């Protein structure tokens, strides 16, 4: 309890760093979450880009 109450009002700093990393990954992992070994639509749009 003494240790737990020692990191309060410090967590906001950890939350901002963790949130920042998630923002720079989330825009990309959307393609990975639905990744399929057979996806002609994914392949076609990747080719065009």
């Amino acid at each position: 309890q003494q240790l737990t109450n020692h990191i309060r009002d410090t967590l906001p700093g950890l939350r901002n760093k963790l949130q920042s990393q998630l923002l720079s990954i989330e825009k990309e992992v959307e393609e990975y979450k639905n990744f399929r070994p057979d996806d002609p639509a994914r392949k076609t749009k990747a080719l065009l880009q």
Partner: protein, 48 residues
């Protein structure tokens, strides 16, 4: 104060309204259009 407002307003709009739009056209417009269903109907040629 007047100098600052005149200075920051052009700069604000270029950052938020025009440059975000250019980046949209170059980077995403192609993906948004392709992702629409029935690309056959989407790309039907005019009878002419």
């Amino acid at each position: 104060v007047n100098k600052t407002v005149r200075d920051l307003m052009p700069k604000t709009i270029m950052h938020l309204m025009i440059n975000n739009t250019k980046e949209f056209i170059f980077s995403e417009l192609l993906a948004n259009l392709y992702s629409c269903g029935d690309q056959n109907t989407l790309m039907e040629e005019s009878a002419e």
